[PDB]
Each structure stands twice: as C-alpha cells, then as structure tokens.
Amino acid sequence: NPCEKHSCIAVIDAGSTGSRLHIYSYDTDDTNTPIHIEEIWNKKIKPGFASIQPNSVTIDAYLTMLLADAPIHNIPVYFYATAGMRLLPQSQQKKYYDELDYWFRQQSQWQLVEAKTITGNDEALFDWLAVNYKLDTLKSVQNKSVGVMDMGGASVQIVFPMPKNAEISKHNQVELNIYGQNINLYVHSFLGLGQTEMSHQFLNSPSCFANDYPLPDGESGQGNAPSCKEEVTSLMNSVHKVNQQIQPLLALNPVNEWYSIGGISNLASSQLFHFENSELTNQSLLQQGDNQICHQQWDILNGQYPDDEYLYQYCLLSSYYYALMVDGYGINPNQTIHYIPPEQNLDWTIGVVLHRALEHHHHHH
Amino acid sequence: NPCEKHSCIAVIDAGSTGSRLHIYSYDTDDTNTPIHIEEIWNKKIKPGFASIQPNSVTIDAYLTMLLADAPIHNIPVYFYATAGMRLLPQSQQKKYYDELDYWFRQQSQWQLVEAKTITGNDEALFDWLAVNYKLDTLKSVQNKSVGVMDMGGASVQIVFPMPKNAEISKHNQVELNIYGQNINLYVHSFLGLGQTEMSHQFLNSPSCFANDYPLPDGESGQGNAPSCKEEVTSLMNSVHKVNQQIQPLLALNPVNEWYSIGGISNLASSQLFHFENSELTNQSLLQQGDNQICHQQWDILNGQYPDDEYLYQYCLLSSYYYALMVDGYGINPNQTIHYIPPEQNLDWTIGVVLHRALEHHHHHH
Ligand code: MOO
Ligand code: MOO
Ligand SMILES: [Cl-]
Ligand SMILES: [Cl-]
Ligand SMILES: [Mg+2]
Ligand SMILES: [Mg+2]
Ligand SMILES: [Mg+2]
Ligand SMILES: [Mg+2]
Ligand SMILES: [Mg+2]
Numbered sequence A, B: 001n002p003c004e005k006h007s008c009i010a011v012i013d014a015g016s017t018g019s020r021l022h023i024y025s026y027d028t029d030d031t032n033t034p035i036h037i038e039e040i041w042n043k044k045i046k047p048g049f050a051s052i053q054p055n056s057v058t059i060d061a062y063l064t065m066l067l068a069d070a071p072i073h074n075i076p077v078y079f080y081a082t083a084g085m086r087l088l089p090q091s092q093q094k095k096y097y098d099e100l101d102y103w104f105r106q107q108s109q110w111q112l113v114e115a116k117t118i119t120g121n122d123e124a125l126f127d128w129l130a131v132n133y134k135l136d137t138l139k140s141v142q143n144k145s146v147g148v149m150d151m152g153g154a155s156v157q158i159v160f161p162m163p164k165n166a167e168i169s170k171h172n173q174v175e176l177n178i179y180g181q182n183i184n185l186y187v188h189s190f191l192g193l194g195q196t197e198m199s200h201q202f203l204n205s206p207s208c209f210a211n212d213y214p215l216p217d218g219e220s221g222q223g224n225a226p227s228c229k230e231e232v233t234s235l236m237n238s239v240h241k242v243n244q245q246i247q248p249l250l251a252l253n254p255v256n257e258w259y260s261i262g263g264i265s266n267l268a269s270s271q272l273f274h275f276e277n278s279e280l281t282n283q284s285l286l287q288q289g290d291n292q293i294c295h296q297q298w299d300i301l302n303g304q305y306p307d308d309e310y311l312y313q314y315c316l317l318s319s320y321y322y323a324l325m326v327d328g329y330g331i332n333p334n335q336t337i338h339y340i341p342p343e344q345n346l347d348w349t350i351g352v353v354l355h356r357a358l359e360h361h362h363h364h365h
C-alpha cells in the first residue's frame, strides 16, 4: 500500500489516440519538490477522449473504464488533454469538460484538481521535465544540452535549453527553478504535424507507400522515401515554417543529446529496421525505410510483418520523421536520436508531478 | 406510397461529418434510364460513420437510427462512404463493413447492393451527374461547359468536361453515354483538402482568426484574409500541386458556369456576407471575410451571430475557399460561382441513381 507511506497523485495524459492514467507515489526534498517518483498504476484506454461522443452516457462509461478499478482513489487528479482536444471547436471542448466535471462531482474520493486542454507549449515543458527526470539530469547543472522531441498523433513538440531571449515570444520560453538550479527552455509545439494529421495530406502520394499498396484513389503505391520526404518537407517548411522558426535557434543553442518520446519508438522497433541501444540516426532511418519498406511489394510486407501496427504507413513515417527532424529542425542526418524503449510507454506526465510543486504557496505566478 | 407507383432506391452518402439517407422514386425512359427522379425521404445522422467505434453494438445502433423509420424498406440500398472512411487503415474499414454487412444480413427487406468506400474520382463523377441532373443539362448536348466543385470535410472534388486525352491518367477521366449523348469528364479529388482536415494545419495561425480569438497555443487571433489565404495556398500548391495539376487543363477546357455543393453554401449563408442569387465571386468572398470577420473582434462576432455554426472559422474558410479556387484551380477572382441554396442539402447521391443504369445487363464494363 504505497500511498500509506508516500504522497500520491494521478495524472491522465488525454492524447489524440487514447487516455493513459498514471498513479505515482513520491517523497519530497527540503523544498517540497518531488523525488523518488515511482509509477504504482498505469491504465490506458482507447480511443482518444476527443473522439468519443460528448454525451453523459458515453463520457461516463469512458471515465469509469479509465478510473474505477484504480487501486487508490482518494488522491489529486489532473486530467490534461493534448492536441486531439485542441483540434475541436471551443463549444465541443466545453461539452466534454462539463460532462467530465459532472462525473467527478459524483465521485466522493477522487480529488479533481484540473481538467482542461493544455497548450502545446505546456506539453513541451512537461515532455522535457519528464525525460530529464528519468535521465537523472535535473538534480545538477549540466555539462551538456539535452533536447527533447515528442512525436504525437496530432502535434509534435520540441524543447531545449536556451537563455532568455526577449526577441522571441514569451509563450515559447520557460524559466524555472528546480532542485536549486535555474533552467531556461525554448518550447514549441506544431499542431497538425503529428503523425495522424500529417498523414491525411499524403494518402494518395504513391512515393509514400510500398509498391502496389492500394491508395484511396485507386492508384498503386510506388514507394521512394527520398521523394516522399520532399513532399512532407513542403508541409514542414512551406506551410508551417518549421525551419525558419527552429533552425536559427538550434544554430545558436546547440543540443548535445537528443531524446524522443511518442511514435518514433513504435516505428523504430519494427524488425524492418536495424538499430541498437534504442537509438537511430535520421540517415539510417530514411535509407532502411527506403530499401526495406518503400521499395518492397505491399502484399509481401503485409504478410511478412503481421504484428506491425500501421505497417502500411512505415514508408511514409520513415520519410516524415526525417523531413521533420532534418529538413525542419535542421538536425544532422548522422546525429544520434535516442528513443525511449517502447515498453516504457514514457510520456510527459511526470512533468506535472514536478511542475505543480515549483511555486509553493504562490497561486498566480 | 410513391414506391407502389414508381421504381425506388435508397442511396446513403456516408461522409466525413454524418450520413444522409435518401430514398428516390423515379420512372425510366426508353433505355431504362431514370427520369422524373424525386426525393421521397431524407434523413441525416451524426457523426460520420468513420467516427463511431467499429463494434456491433455502436454500428447496429447507428444503422438502426439511420434506417429503421424510413417509410419504405424493400428496395435496393447503396451505402457509399467518402473521404472520412478513406482516411482510415484498411483493417479498420474492413471492421466497419464486416459489421455493416452482418447488420444488413439480419434485415429482411433492405436489399444491400454495395457498401464500400468509393474513390474521390467516383464521388466527383456522381457530383457532376447529380448537379447537371438538377440543372436539367443532361438530356441534350450543351453549348456551355458546366463545372462542379464539391467542398467536403475531408476531400474536395472538381469535375468538368474534357475530351479524352491519352496523356492524362485513365483514373481522372470518365466517358459516359446518357440520354443519347456522349460525355467526357475530367475528375479529381484532393484528399486532405476538405475543410476539416485543411483547418488542422492552420489553427495556430493568427492571420486566420478574428481579432482576439484564443488560439490553442495561447496566442490571439489577428485576422487578415489575404495573409491567411497565402498560408493556405502553400498547402494547395507547394504540398498538393493543385495548380500544376488543374490549371493547365482548365486553360485548354474552359468552364462557362461553375456550381458548387458542400460547405460553400453554409459559409456564404451567414449574414456577415452580402451575396445575391445564391452566387458569389472569390474576390467578394475574400474581401467580405477580411473586413467583416478577420478584422473584427471575436467576442463581438460570437455574440452578434449566435446561430452561425463554426463562426470562429469563417475568416479561415473565406481565405481557404479563395486559396483553393483562385490560387489552386486558377479560377478568375471575378468569375461567378453558383452555390446550391443550403436548404436543399444537395449532394452527389442522384449521380448513383443514374450511373447504375448506364451499362444495362453488362456486369463488368
Ligand atoms: O494528443 Mo497527441 O497524440 O500527443 O498529438
Ligand atoms: O466525406 Mo467528405 O465530408 O464529402 O470530404
Ligand atoms: Cl481518393
Ligand atoms: Cl498548441
Ligand atoms: Mg502525447
Ligand atoms: Mg530484432
Ligand atoms: Mg460529401
Ligand atoms: Mg480526424
Ligand atoms: Mg440576409
């Protein structure tokens, strides 16, 4: 019974593809900042909260499915929705939260702190805090710059150390004080550039699918990762101006180690790829995707890798990740990108556990 | 009961935002081609079929809601899904159709002819047939070229007369013989360019929202339709190459009269616009959206136009329709675009009633 010996908190990541409940036990240091954070419960359900009908019956069944069987209920809960909910009209988001708030008003133990759609900049902050907590890089001032990417279904986040810059929007910068050190981060989220939303722009692009894959328009895949990559790069740069926004900042504030969470782990774990030590390079990702996936016959691939979820998109996703990281962020194709092993299902939720403590009894900072 | 006096057929348009059942009565001419087509039943339900959970309980409820109270059931039924279903994995589409097939197997009167996701090119053919049927332009050879656009949530279609060309893909050309005339059409659908999917790439663009509209990233709208239009044009052309594909063909094959169905009629019916005769020009649409919507204060607009669905997107949609029609298709900003009055809810379903008869007892043409 860990919550009889430690503080405990529930954090729900309500993302575009599903909601994942975490309960963490933790202790605190001399400034009442969480340490010894341990996950004691993890439950995920599908589909995304923004994808279910926003009526009482459906939302009530979904929250019961997510929460009722948790081992401890008398604890603070944060329900934070991300890019899936950001895509909806305000009226629709309000209907979801009104029904969710009603559901919690009928719960006598759960302590609902907040339920809301967070900005992609908050999500990026929590991404960086969660990964650095796990890497054990927060307790002391670092030799090296650690950058984090989160590759979601609807948005993608990038976040890295950068000194305050009064020429850049206040919304894209965060200063915090944690474990005795002052940290200044650049944060950005690109809504629409998550894998699900991006893919809906390229489904009839033959270069983005394995040979003979049946495209929606009745034509056939004819995969070519470099060509698909160039198409996705036009969405990255001509549309979203990722290069113009990110490249000059990384040039001035280089990152020594890149970590990624989200969907790269799922792709890179395919047996179609040869990666070791839970790390890849963009050049190897694009080359392997081109040679083993894009240029292979669809029917053969399909039968040969039967456990590979969204295998039909692996030519597209190899090309898209390279477009995003290389052509968008300007990362060198030969630079190592660490991905957190998929078994961990690491998300940003530990960031909430840490962040909520940093202002103590100041309520409006 | 019309169907005791006439042939009858049910056609379901299962689009990205909902499904609309029509039952038509009709007679036939001396080639057994439908004439005197009349709508005797129309029922719409939300949301889109591709948006409900694909299990027997939910699918069964949805088809029951859509079909059970129809006045006549012992007739052929076509269930044709469009771009909403095109966006999904093949496995997921198979789940939906396996459950739908099972549901129809428990029905003793409905005669399910086909239930499938049709290509955007098929949808574009039906778009042209349905509109030209309503305009009464099919029975005799036209001295005028009539073009049709269908502005959907996930795809948009364009279709216009074009003599058969050996240099253009067979998939984008259709020859038919109807009412004794031979008609040759160019058809194209752009998946990802329907309004819902398009909008997901611009939700954090301040130029695309009314002043002080709260964007997902925490920043404020600062509307400017020409600027928003140039952003949306980069998705049309740099990404989808609409201009390169369409403009040369319209240059060689001018359209004399443009008609649109789908979302234009919803937008243009707002009291923010001044249009007459159910027609607009792109020049006027972009100017009016810029000055009445983009440059206005969000809270004022929101309270002033309380019945306007998706009012918060009208600066974006004005800018996007211009980007698509002018910068994409190359239509002159001063060219009249007819929109079918919104009360009609005219879709492409009459196109199915006509097209199914054209090959008579030939089953593999
Ligand atoms: O809600 Mo997301 O899947 O992290 O873009
Ligand atoms: O399924 Mo659509 O809404 O006609 O693009
Ligand atoms: Cl298509
Ligand atoms: Cl955001
Ligand atoms: Mg996420
Ligand atoms: Mg292996
Ligand atoms: Mg439609
Ligand atoms: Mg969607
Ligand atoms: Mg009026």
Ligand code: NA
Residues within 6 Å of the ligand: A196, A197, A198, A200, B196, B197, B198, B200
């Ligand atoms: Na999308």
